[PDB]
């Protein structure tokens, strides 16, 4: 019961700003962005957020809300368990590190 | 039990098309592809979130088509996935897969 | 499964020291990718799937060699890995690592 989760979302590159700015506005700044390819192999954007479990549903809504375009290929959101999180700067561990 | 898993494989870049097409032929199209480095030589990472019962099937496909018989053929990892959500429809569980 | 994935996001200028330090400690199996983090500044992601007993030292190596004393040094995540398969020999479990 770590109560820490990784949110992994694959979205359209043209939806990054709207999804990033919407997340920033909700107080979710800890985010990793990478250029990938998905489903032909079209350029896509992967976003990763390691957060407190209680924040997962809120982030899903924000990602789901902003990323939607109503067309096929909008992307998916994955929830992956995280058993530990550590801050490199102070070696602090746990939910405090998030 | 979640019954949803993430298949994460690091493979040679020259084996991507052959592995991709093999998976598509077997009905596994949902896949994310990213360029990485490993050993620092360039490699290709493929990710598939699938139903648990399909894992063994996909492992076979990747291993059979990514293998060249030399060191560096890559490795396949299975990571638990507790939830999957479809952006277009917000469907969760195996339906979103 | 007693197998775990170590995923660390660090400053790009600390990759070599962390990379070389891990290999010096006997940790050669590692994947490196270029990513962005916060505003959307270049960062480096390093992934290692290892035996659970080795995680702690790897946390130590990454944290001690990636830290600079400034804010934004990065984080280390521990994710469960339920299976590892060697593409070439198709060997699974902790032996495959
Ligand atoms: Cl869709
Ligand atoms: Cl993962």
Numbering used by the authors:
A (entry chain A): -2 to 36, 54 to 112
B (entry chain B): -2 to 36, 55 to 112
C (entry chain C): -1 to 36, 54 to 112
What does the paper say about this structure?
PII-family proteins are key players in the regulation of nitrogen metabolism in bacteria, archaea and in the plastids of plant/algae. The monomeric unit, of circa 11–18 kDa, consists of two α-helices, four β-strands (organized in a double ferredoxin-like fold β1α1β2β3α2β4) and three protruding loops called B, C and T. In the trimeric state, clefts are formed at the dimeric interface through the interaction of the B-loop and the base of the T-loop of one subunit with the C-loop of the adjacent one.
An extra electron density for nucleotides does not exist in the ligand-binding site of the MtGlnK2 apo structure and seems to be replaced by water molecules. However, an additional electron density lies between the modelled GlnK2 trimers composing the asymmetric unit.
